[PDB]
Amino acid sequence: QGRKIFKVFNQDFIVDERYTVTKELGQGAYGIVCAAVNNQTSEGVAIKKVTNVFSKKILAKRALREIKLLQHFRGHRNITCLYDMDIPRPDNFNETYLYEELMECDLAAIIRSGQPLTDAHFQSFIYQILCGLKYIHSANVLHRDLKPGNLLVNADCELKICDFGLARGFSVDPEENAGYMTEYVATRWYRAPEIMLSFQSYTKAIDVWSVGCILAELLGGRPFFKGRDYVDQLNQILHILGTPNEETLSRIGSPRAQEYVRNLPFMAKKPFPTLFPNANPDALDLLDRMLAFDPSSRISVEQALEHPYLHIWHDASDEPDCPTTFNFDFEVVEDVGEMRKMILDEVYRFRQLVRTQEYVGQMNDLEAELAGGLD
Ligand SMILES: CNC(=O)[C@H](Cc1c[nH]c2ccccc12)NC(=O)c1ccc2cncc(-c3cc(OC(F)(F)F)ccc3OC)c2n1
């Protein structure tokens, strides 16, 4: 066997025998998560039981998407690192276990706690997000659902992005970009306006917008655009950013939406200094650029990393790109039996994988020559 069975969330939770489940962390539409310790090494881990994987084609597609994306993005300081995967009952398996780097809080909880945060905390959080996002984007992946809840934080206030279940491909080739699959809808409060407005310009700017909403939420201590539905969300965005210009207006590819926006009364932009009069002016300038209504005017991740607000943190030599782009060919598979086969392949291949000039060099070279000279 080699495994232990725990009872959590009123169901079986079957883990590697090296681990002891310590604590229930949460449950969502896709499974349940517990914290655990490696009893030998005392290392902590989050164990995620992805549940009912083959109950719906959509659940199996999401599981396979998360499994592959998590592997692609291991080894970044600001991204939750996948350590292991396991399928304890492979005969008729309807679940997969992912073993991920454990994190004590999330940014939504920290903001909820009301604990005091300094402008330096805000800078650190935004910087870390953008570093992780630069890595993800450099692989031509859009996270697509960034929000305080998926930004995990430990006691050192170190921050890591999690949850690739809704991520989406991106391509500069319009035909390819339009074919990338989007099974689930992202979180309304944080979703970029060009999406509900059918700009058809699905771009990396959609994530930058979410980062802006997060910065705004840090500055005010509460969600910035808190729409109860999409009409309400639109009205709240426009009430802050104001009537867009004719060019932006004409990019609204949805006729009811364009009609609605065009007929609204004039609305002046509400300047962010009036809304956050105690904030650092550099924070509000970067906020203004991240919450540009029109994606074409929105700051890019790399420009944001170079913004004066983050100049203390910015070290381009310390902001790596991902070595390769991620391949989304799998998402054309529509047969669940084949998705099962592919998930087994992913898990077994990953399991074997994880179980496998400078001054000194110049002087070592010179030393070897000086010893092996004459004679
Ligand atoms: C908002 N988005 C998510 O929270 C997804 C949800 C998700 C994506 N795929 C899944 C498959 C099965 C079950 C859940 C998921 N969490 C993760 O990606 C994930 C990654 C590394 C983690 C490392 N340490 C802790 C957690 C954690 C889990 C919790 O439990 C919950 F249930 F996740 F809330 C609650 C708080 C936590 O940290 C403070 C972690 N969480």
Author numbering: 5 to 360, 394 to 412
Please share text taken word for word from the publication where this structure appeared.
Fungal proteins that function during the infection process might be potential candidates, and Mps1 (M. oryzae mitogen-activated protein kinase 1) is such a protein that plays a critical role in appressorium penetration of the plant cell wall. Mps1 plays a role in appressorium penetration and invasive hyphal growth periods but does not influence the formation of appressoria. As a typical kinase, the overall structure of Mps1 can be divided into two domains, a smaller N-terminal lobe (N-lobe, residues Q5 to E104) and a larger C-terminal lobe (C-lobe, residues C109 to D412), with a hinge region (residues E105 to E108) connecting them. The deep cleft between the N-lobe and the C-lobe serves as the catalytic pocket for binding the cosubstrate ATP and substrates.
Cocrystallization of A378-0 with Mps1 revealed that A378-0 binds to the catalytic pocket of Mps1, while the three ring-type substructures of A378-0 constitute a triangle that squeezes into the pocket. The structure was determined at a 2.15-Å resolution. Structural superimposition with apo-Mps1 shows a root mean square deviation (RMSD) of 0.311 Å, indicating that only subtle conformational changes occurred in the newly determined structure. A378-0 exhibits a compact conformation for squeezing into the pocket: the indole ring is oriented perpendicular to the central 1,6-naphthyridine ring, the benzene ring tilts about 45° from the 1,6-naphthyridine ring, and thus, the planes of the three rings approximate an equilateral right triangle. There are seven intermolecular hydrogen bonds between A378-0 and Mps1. Residues G30 and Q31 belong to the glycine-rich loop (G-loop) between strands β1 and β2 of Mps1, and the formation of the two hydrogen bonds results in an extension of the β1-strand compared with apo-Mps1. Second, one nitrogen atom of the 1,6-naphthyridine ring interacts with the main-chain oxygen of residue M107 of the hinge region of Mps1, which leads to a conformational change of the hinge and the emergence of the β6-strand compared with apo-Mps1. Third, amide group I of A378-0 uses its oxygen atom to interact with the side chain nitrogen of residue K52 of the β3-strand of Mps1, while amide group II of A378-0 uses its nitrogen atom to interact with the side chain oxygen of residue D167 of the DFG motif of Mps1, rendering stabilization of residue D167 to point inward, i.e., Mps1 in the “DFG-aspartate-in” state (the side chain of the aspartate of the DFG motif points to the cleft). Finally, the last two hydrogen bonds occur between the nitrogen atom of the indole ring of A378-0 and the two oxygen atoms of the side chain carboxyl group of residue E70 of Mps1, which stabilizes the αC-helix in the “αC-helix-in” conformation (the side chain of the glutamate of the αC-helix points to the cleft). Besides hydrogen bonds, hydrophobic interactions also function in stabilizing A378-0 in the cleft between the N- and C-lobes of Mps1.
